Short mmCIF file of C-alpha atoms in Angstrom, two decimals:
data_model
loop_
_atom_site.label_atom_id
_atom_site.label_comp_id
_atom_site.label_asym_id
_atom_site.label_seq_id
_atom_site.Cartn_x
_atom_site.Cartn_y
_atom_site.Cartn_z
CA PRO I 1 39.28 -26.64 -19.31
CA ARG I 2 36.83 -24.98 -16.86
CA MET I 3 37.75 -27.22 -13.92
CA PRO I 4 39.52 -24.53 -11.82
CA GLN I 5 36.28 -22.56 -12.06
CA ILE I 6 34.35 -25.65 -10.92
CA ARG I 7 36.67 -26.00 -7.92
CA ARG I 8 36.21 -22.30 -7.13
CA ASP I 9 32.42 -22.69 -7.37
CA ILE I 10 32.36 -25.72 -5.06
CA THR I 11 34.61 -24.11 -2.43
CA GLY I 12 32.62 -20.88 -2.56
CA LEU I 13 29.38 -22.84 -2.25
CA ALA I 14 30.67 -24.55 0.89
CA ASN I 15 31.81 -21.24 2.41
CA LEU I 16 28.54 -19.48 1.53
CA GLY I 17 26.55 -22.33 3.04
CA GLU I 18 28.56 -21.99 6.25
CA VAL I 19 28.00 -18.22 6.36
CA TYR I 20 24.26 -18.54 5.68
CA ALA I 21 23.90 -21.28 8.30
CA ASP I 22 25.66 -19.03 10.81
CA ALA I 23 23.51 -16.00 9.95
CA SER I 24 20.15 -17.77 9.49
CA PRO I 25 18.62 -17.99 13.02
CA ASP I 26 18.84 -14.22 13.49
CA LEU I 27 17.41 -13.67 10.01
CA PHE I 28 14.43 -15.93 10.67
CA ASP I 29 13.67 -14.48 14.12
CA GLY I 30 13.80 -11.04 12.51
CA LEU I 31 11.52 -12.32 9.76
CA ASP I 32 9.00 -13.56 12.35
CA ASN I 33 8.86 -10.22 14.14
CA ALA I 34 8.87 -8.44 10.76
CA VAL I 35 5.87 -10.58 9.81
CA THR I 36 4.15 -9.30 12.95
CA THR I 37 4.88 -5.65 12.17
CA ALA I 38 4.08 -6.16 8.47
CA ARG I 39 0.68 -7.55 9.43
CA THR I 40 0.25 -4.43 11.57
CA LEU I 41 1.22 -2.19 8.63
CA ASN I 42 -1.13 -4.04 6.26
CA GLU I 43 -4.06 -3.70 8.67
CA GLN I 44 -3.61 0.11 8.67
CA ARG I 45 -2.65 0.92 5.07
CA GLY I 46 -5.19 3.74 4.90
CA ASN I 47 -3.86 5.31 8.09
CA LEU I 48 -0.30 5.18 6.72
CA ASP I 49 -1.31 6.77 3.40
CA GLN I 50 -3.29 9.52 5.14
CA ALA I 51 -0.31 10.13 7.43
CA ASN W 1 41.30 -40.09 -22.01
CA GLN W 2 39.02 -37.13 -21.27
CA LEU W 3 37.02 -39.25 -18.82
CA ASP W 4 40.27 -40.08 -17.03
CA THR W 5 41.07 -36.36 -16.82
CA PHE W 6 37.57 -35.41 -15.64
CA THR W 7 37.39 -38.16 -13.02
CA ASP W 8 40.85 -37.27 -11.66
CA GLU W 9 39.92 -33.59 -11.40
CA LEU W 10 36.64 -34.43 -9.65
CA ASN W 11 38.35 -36.86 -7.26
CA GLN W 12 40.80 -34.10 -6.32
CA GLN W 13 37.78 -32.13 -5.00
CA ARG W 14 36.07 -34.88 -2.98
CA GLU W 15 36.84 -33.18 0.34
CA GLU W 16 35.41 -29.87 -0.88
CA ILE W 17 32.32 -31.64 -2.25
CA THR W 18 31.84 -33.35 1.13
CA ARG W 19 32.24 -30.04 2.96
CA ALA W 20 29.73 -28.38 0.61
CA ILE W 21 27.29 -31.25 1.22
CA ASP W 22 27.63 -30.82 4.99
CA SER W 23 27.25 -27.03 4.78
CA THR W 24 24.19 -27.24 2.54
CA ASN W 25 22.72 -29.88 4.87
CA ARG W 26 23.13 -27.61 7.90
CA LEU W 27 21.66 -24.56 6.14
CA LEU W 28 18.75 -26.54 4.70
CA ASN W 29 18.01 -28.10 8.10
CA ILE W 30 17.83 -24.63 9.67
CA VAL W 31 15.56 -23.35 6.91
CA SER W 32 13.41 -26.50 7.05
CA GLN W 33 12.86 -26.00 10.77
CA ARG W 34 11.98 -22.35 10.06
CA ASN W 35 9.62 -23.26 7.18
CA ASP W 36 6.78 -21.84 9.31
CA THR W 37 8.38 -18.39 9.34
CA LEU W 38 9.13 -18.84 5.63
CA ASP W 39 5.43 -19.42 4.91
CA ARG W 40 4.41 -16.45 7.07
CA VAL W 41 6.82 -14.19 5.19
CA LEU W 42 5.65 -15.44 1.79
CA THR W 43 2.04 -14.77 2.83
CA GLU W 44 2.30 -11.38 4.55
CA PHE W 45 5.23 -9.53 2.94
CA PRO W 46 4.35 -9.50 -0.83
CA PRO W 47 1.18 -7.40 -0.24
CA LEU W 48 3.19 -4.91 1.83
CA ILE W 49 5.92 -4.68 -0.83
CA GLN W 50 3.33 -4.25 -3.58
CA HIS W 51 1.62 -1.45 -1.64
CA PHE W 52 4.96 0.27 -0.96
CA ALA W 53 5.83 0.08 -4.66
CA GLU W 54 2.42 1.59 -5.45
CA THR W 55 2.98 4.57 -3.11
CA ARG W 56 6.75 5.09 -3.40
CA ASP W 57 6.24 8.58 -4.86
CA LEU W 58 4.01 9.62 -1.95
CA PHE W 59 6.56 8.35 0.58
CA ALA W 60 9.34 10.26 -1.17
CA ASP W 61 7.19 13.40 -1.23
CA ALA W 62 6.45 13.05 2.49
CA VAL W 63 10.13 12.59 3.36
CA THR W 64 11.19 15.53 1.18
CA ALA W 65 8.49 17.82 2.60
CA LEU W 66 9.47 16.93 6.17
CA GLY W 67 13.09 17.58 5.20
CA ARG W 68 12.20 20.95 3.68
CA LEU W 69 10.47 21.94 6.92
CA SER W 70 13.25 20.53 9.09
CA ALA W 71 16.12 22.26 7.27
CA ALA W 72 14.70 25.72 7.96
CA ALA W 73 13.59 24.65 11.44
CA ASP W 74 17.09 23.40 12.27
CA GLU W 75 18.85 26.50 10.96
CA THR W 76 16.44 28.74 12.91
CA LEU W 77 16.71 26.74 16.15
CA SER W 78 20.50 26.50 15.92
CA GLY W 79 21.02 30.16 15.02
CA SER W 80 18.89 31.25 18.00
CA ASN W 81 19.70 28.65 20.67
CA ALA W 82 22.18 30.85 22.56
CA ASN W 83 20.80 34.33 21.84
CA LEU W 84 17.36 33.28 23.09
CA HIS W 85 18.89 31.84 26.26
CA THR W 86 20.87 35.03 26.88
CA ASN W 87 17.84 37.24 26.23
CA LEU W 88 15.65 35.18 28.58
CA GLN W 89 18.27 35.19 31.33
CA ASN W 90 18.66 38.96 30.95
CA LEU W 91 14.92 39.67 30.85
CA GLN W 92 14.27 37.61 34.00
CA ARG W 93 14.95 40.60 36.28
CA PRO W 94 12.89 43.18 34.28
CA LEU W 95 10.00 40.70 34.09
CA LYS W 96 10.04 40.18 37.86
CA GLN W 97 10.27 43.91 38.57
CA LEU W 98 7.42 44.63 36.13
CA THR O 1 16.26 -43.61 -15.14
CA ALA O 2 15.27 -41.28 -12.29
CA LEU O 3 17.51 -38.56 -13.73
CA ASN O 4 16.18 -39.13 -17.27
CA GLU O 5 12.56 -38.83 -16.13
CA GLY O 6 13.41 -35.44 -14.61
CA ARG O 7 15.87 -34.52 -17.35
CA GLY O 8 13.65 -31.83 -18.88
CA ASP O 9 13.10 -30.17 -15.51
CA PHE O 10 16.83 -30.32 -14.75
CA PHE O 11 17.84 -28.67 -18.01
CA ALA O 12 15.14 -26.03 -17.61
CA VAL O 13 16.77 -25.32 -14.23
CA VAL O 14 20.15 -25.16 -15.97
CA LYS O 15 18.93 -22.66 -18.58
CA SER O 16 17.25 -20.51 -15.93
CA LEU O 17 20.26 -20.44 -13.62
CA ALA O 18 22.31 -19.61 -16.72
CA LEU O 19 20.18 -16.52 -17.30
CA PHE O 20 20.39 -15.67 -13.59
CA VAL O 21 24.19 -15.82 -13.43
CA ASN O 22 24.60 -14.11 -16.82
CA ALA O 23 22.57 -11.18 -15.51
CA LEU O 24 24.06 -10.99 -11.98
CA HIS O 25 27.75 -11.92 -12.41
CA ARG O 26 29.21 -8.54 -13.41
CA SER O 27 28.04 -6.58 -10.34
CA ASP O 28 29.90 -8.54 -7.66
CA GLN O 29 31.68 -5.54 -6.12
CA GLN O 30 28.24 -3.93 -6.13
CA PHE O 31 26.92 -6.84 -4.06
CA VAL O 32 29.79 -6.59 -1.56
CA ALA O 33 29.16 -2.85 -1.26
CA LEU O 34 25.44 -3.55 -0.83
CA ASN O 35 26.10 -5.96 2.04
CA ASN O 36 28.44 -3.49 3.76
CA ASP O 37 26.03 -0.57 3.28
CA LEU O 38 23.13 -2.65 4.61
CA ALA O 39 25.17 -3.58 7.68
CA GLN O 40 26.10 0.06 8.29
CA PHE O 41 22.52 1.28 7.77
CA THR O 42 21.17 -1.28 10.23
CA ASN O 43 23.96 -0.35 12.66
CA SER O 44 22.71 3.25 12.43
CA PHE O 45 19.55 2.24 14.35
CA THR O 46 20.95 -0.36 16.81
CA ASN O 47 23.56 1.70 18.65
CA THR O 48 21.74 1.04 21.95
CA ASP O 49 19.44 -1.70 23.21
CA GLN O 50 16.08 0.11 23.00
CA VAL Y 1 19.47 -32.23 1.81
CA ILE Y 2 16.91 -33.62 -0.64
CA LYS Y 3 14.16 -33.71 1.99
CA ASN Y 4 14.71 -30.21 3.40
CA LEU Y 5 15.24 -28.66 -0.03
CA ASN Y 6 12.00 -30.31 -1.15
CA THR Y 7 10.20 -28.81 1.85
CA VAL Y 8 11.53 -25.30 1.19
CA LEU Y 9 10.86 -25.58 -2.55
CA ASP Y 10 7.26 -26.72 -2.13
CA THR Y 11 6.69 -23.90 0.36
CA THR Y 12 8.03 -21.45 -2.23
CA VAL Y 13 5.98 -23.04 -5.04
CA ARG Y 14 2.79 -22.73 -2.97
CA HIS Y 15 3.30 -18.94 -3.07
CA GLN Y 16 4.92 -18.90 -6.53
CA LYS Y 17 2.61 -16.13 -7.77
CA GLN Y 18 3.43 -13.89 -4.80
CA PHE Y 19 7.12 -14.83 -4.93
CA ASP Y 20 7.18 -13.81 -8.60
CA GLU Y 21 5.30 -10.53 -8.07
CA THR Y 22 7.35 -9.43 -5.05
CA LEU Y 23 10.60 -9.35 -7.05
CA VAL Y 24 9.14 -6.92 -9.60
CA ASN Y 25 7.43 -4.84 -6.91
CA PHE Y 26 10.63 -4.63 -4.84
CA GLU Y 27 12.63 -3.66 -7.93
CA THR Y 28 10.14 -0.91 -8.78
CA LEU Y 29 10.11 0.43 -5.21
CA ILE Y 30 13.90 0.38 -4.85
CA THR Y 31 14.44 2.01 -8.26
CA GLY Y 32 11.93 4.73 -7.40
CA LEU Y 33 13.71 5.37 -4.10
CA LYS Y 34 17.16 5.33 -5.76
CA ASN Y 35 16.05 7.94 -8.31
CA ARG Y 36 15.45 10.32 -5.35
CA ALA Y 37 18.06 8.91 -2.93
CA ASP Y 38 20.00 12.16 -2.55
CA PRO Y 39 16.94 14.31 -1.63
CA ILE Y 40 15.72 11.47 0.61
CA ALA Y 41 19.04 11.21 2.46
CA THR Y 42 19.28 15.00 2.74
CA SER Y 43 15.74 15.12 4.15
CA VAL Y 44 16.43 12.35 6.69
CA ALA Y 45 19.58 14.12 7.87
CA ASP Y 46 17.71 17.44 8.11
CA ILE Y 47 14.92 15.78 10.13
CA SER Y 48 17.47 14.36 12.57
CA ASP Y 49 19.26 17.71 12.84
CA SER E 1 16.89 -11.97 -13.09
CA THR E 2 17.34 -8.54 -14.68
CA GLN E 3 14.93 -7.12 -12.10
CA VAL E 4 16.89 -8.87 -9.34
CA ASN E 5 20.22 -7.38 -10.43
CA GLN E 6 18.73 -3.92 -10.95
CA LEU E 7 17.06 -3.99 -7.53
CA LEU E 8 20.33 -5.08 -5.89
CA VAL E 9 22.44 -2.35 -7.50
CA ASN E 10 19.81 0.34 -6.86
CA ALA E 11 19.56 -0.79 -3.23
CA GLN E 12 23.34 -0.45 -2.95
CA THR E 13 23.17 3.06 -4.42
CA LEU E 14 20.32 4.12 -2.12
CA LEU E 15 21.97 2.69 0.99
CA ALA E 16 25.25 4.43 0.13
CA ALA E 17 23.44 7.74 -0.41
CA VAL E 18 21.69 7.40 2.95
CA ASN E 19 24.88 6.30 4.72
CA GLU E 20 27.06 9.18 3.48
CA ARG E 21 25.32 11.38 6.08
CA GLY E 22 25.76 8.65 8.67
CA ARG E 23 26.57 10.88 11.64
CA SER E 24 23.12 12.51 11.84
CA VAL E 25 21.15 9.46 10.64
CA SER E 26 22.67 7.33 13.42
CA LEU E 27 21.19 9.73 15.99
CA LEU E 28 17.72 9.96 14.40
CA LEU E 29 15.89 7.70 16.87
CA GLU E 30 17.72 9.10 19.91
CA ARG E 31 17.02 12.69 18.86
CA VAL E 32 13.35 12.06 18.08
CA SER E 33 12.89 10.37 21.47
CA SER E 34 14.72 13.24 23.18
CA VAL E 35 12.63 15.93 21.48
CA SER E 36 9.46 13.96 22.28
CA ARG E 37 10.41 13.87 25.96
CA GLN E 38 11.32 17.57 25.94
CA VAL E 39 7.99 18.60 24.37
CA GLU E 40 6.10 16.36 26.80
CA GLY E 41 7.92 17.90 29.75
CA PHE E 42 7.42 21.45 28.46
CA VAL E 43 3.67 20.95 28.06
CA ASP E 44 3.30 19.07 31.35
CA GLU E 45 5.24 21.60 33.45
CA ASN E 46 3.17 24.62 32.29
CA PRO E 47 -0.48 24.04 33.24
CA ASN E 48 -1.04 27.82 33.25
CA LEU E 49 0.13 28.47 29.68
CA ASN E 50 -3.45 28.61 28.41
CA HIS E 51 -4.49 31.09 31.12
CA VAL E 52 -1.56 33.36 30.22
CA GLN C 1 28.53 -13.13 -0.93
CA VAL C 2 31.26 -15.05 0.92
CA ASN C 3 33.63 -12.07 1.18
CA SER C 4 30.99 -9.92 2.91
CA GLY C 5 29.90 -12.69 5.29
CA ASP C 6 30.60 -10.58 8.37
CA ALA C 7 28.41 -7.80 6.97
CA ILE C 8 25.49 -10.14 6.26
CA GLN C 9 25.75 -11.67 9.74
CA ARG C 10 25.78 -8.17 11.24
CA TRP C 11 22.73 -6.96 9.36
CA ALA C 12 20.92 -10.23 10.10
CA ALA C 13 21.51 -9.67 13.82
CA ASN C 14 20.48 -6.01 13.54
CA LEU C 15 17.35 -6.98 11.60
CA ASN C 16 16.52 -9.43 14.39
CA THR C 17 16.99 -6.71 17.02
CA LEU C 18 15.00 -4.01 15.20
CA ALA C 19 12.20 -6.41 14.29
CA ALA C 20 11.95 -7.64 17.88
CA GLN C 21 11.74 -4.06 19.15
CA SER C 22 9.08 -3.18 16.56
CA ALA C 23 6.98 -6.29 17.30
CA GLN C 24 7.15 -5.85 21.09
CA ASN C 25 5.64 -2.36 20.64
CA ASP C 26 2.86 -3.33 18.23
CA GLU C 27 0.14 -1.43 20.09
CA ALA C 28 2.39 1.63 20.36
CA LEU C 29 2.97 1.48 16.59
CA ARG C 30 -0.77 1.19 15.88
CA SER C 31 -1.60 4.12 18.17
CA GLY C 32 1.26 6.11 16.65
CA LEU C 33 -0.14 5.71 13.14
CA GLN C 34 -3.69 6.38 14.37
CA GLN C 35 -2.60 9.64 16.00
CA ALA C 36 -0.13 10.65 13.28
CA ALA C 37 -2.90 10.73 10.69
CA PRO C 38 -4.77 13.74 12.27
CA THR C 39 -2.02 15.48 14.25
CA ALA C 40 -0.16 16.55 11.10
CA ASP C 41 -3.48 17.96 9.88
CA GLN C 42 -3.82 19.88 13.16
CA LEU C 43 -0.28 21.26 12.86
CA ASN C 44 -0.91 22.20 9.22
CA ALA C 45 -4.14 23.99 10.14
CA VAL C 46 -2.49 25.94 12.97
CA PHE C 47 0.44 26.94 10.76
CA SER C 48 -1.75 27.90 7.79
CA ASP C 49 -3.72 30.09 10.20
CA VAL C 50 -0.52 32.00 11.04
CA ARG C 51 1.00 31.59 7.57
#
């Protein structure tokens, strides 16, 4: 009885995979540079709190 | 009978299952080749997020205090932008003659 | 046999994803609004190149 | 799919403690910010102005 | 999962609250850079302010 | 998630851009924090003098 919902789930999964695969390289480059700036923020936590 | 129904309904979605397999394969390949960035995030971000959660109140207080200063500063500097300019331009000659 | 050896892990996954979806399914319009608001907020700081 | 998902999953499992803690910490931070969102947004706009 | 859903909805609320004043927020970086340059120029162009 | 795919792609690209800009100015960010810690104290002292 829940087979239309299964079909909806599978089609949505395919579409979401396509969208994520299209949006992933930018996300991961941003995550690399965000790792750099997050390391910078962690190294100066006391300065940030005093600020 | 129910197995016949279930197998027919699954077979009607073989193209969508294939497309989902291909899409998941592409996404997982991209994430697998960015596993290095994934590891860097999972090592360096959780401490930052924990610290930010620890000092959320202080950040909110800083933003609100800067906003309290800036509201009055903005109203003063916008209510006097033109009158100050006019007064300076008028006083130029008396200042030179004095 | 391979599925049966990992059957306990698979059904633990099923029960956990069940809790996940049961907690997150109602706020779908909220998620769409969150994505749009995030896009707009990030657009607020990338109007120019630098 | 199996290979790459295994890679990503073992990477996540290696930091499972941090991956578990960051969800709660992010929820706490975001809830604390949401409880003062309107003063925060007003203050940001006033700073810009 | 409850924490995940609560964080998502609260993030949506916070982002909406910030975005409602989106005209002035969108100019925040430009205006802070502009005021920084103006203050730098004002201080640099008046070496005799301290003497006065 | 599928319906707002354009939005997630847009904020992924914007995250990439902002993170790249922040990482490329790492030393500027460090010096900014280092100077922002005492300069607000200086401004506060000057203002409280003429409070």
